[PDB]
Structures are given as structure tokens and as C-alpha cells.
Amino acid sequence: ECRWFWGGCNNDADCCKHLECKRKWPHICLWDGTFT
């Protein structure tokens, strides 16, 4: 399972495949939009 929008995380893996975690505090799971 992964974290949803505004769920919290530290790394990109922590967030879903589509959701990307910002590498700058505050660290949260956001939406990328671009297909990996």
C-alpha cells in the first residue's frame, strides 16, 4: 500500500507510483501528472 494526497512521507517510494513526495520539508505526497 502507498500514501494518498496529503498523507505524509520521506521518500518517493513512500508515496504511490503516481504520487511523488517532495524532497523539501515539509515532505508530503503530491501529484506528478507525468507518466513514469
Provide the greatest CA pair distance for the chain. 24
Whose grid coordinates read 505524509? 8
Strands (E) across the chain are located at: 19-21, 29-31
In degrees, rounded to 5, the angle at the alpha carbon of residue 20 between the alpha carbons of residues 14 and 25 is: 80
Q: Which residues contact 4 (CB under 8 A, 6 or more apart)?
A: 16, 19, 29
Domain count within the chain: 1
CA distances from 7 to 2, 10, 14, 17 (A): 9, 11, 10, 14
Burial of 12 (0-12, 13-18, 19+ CB in 10 A): middle
Q: How many Å apart are CA 24 and CA 1, to the nearest integer?
A: 23
**Technique used by the depositors:** NMR
Write out the residue range of the structural domain in which residue 11 sits. 1-36
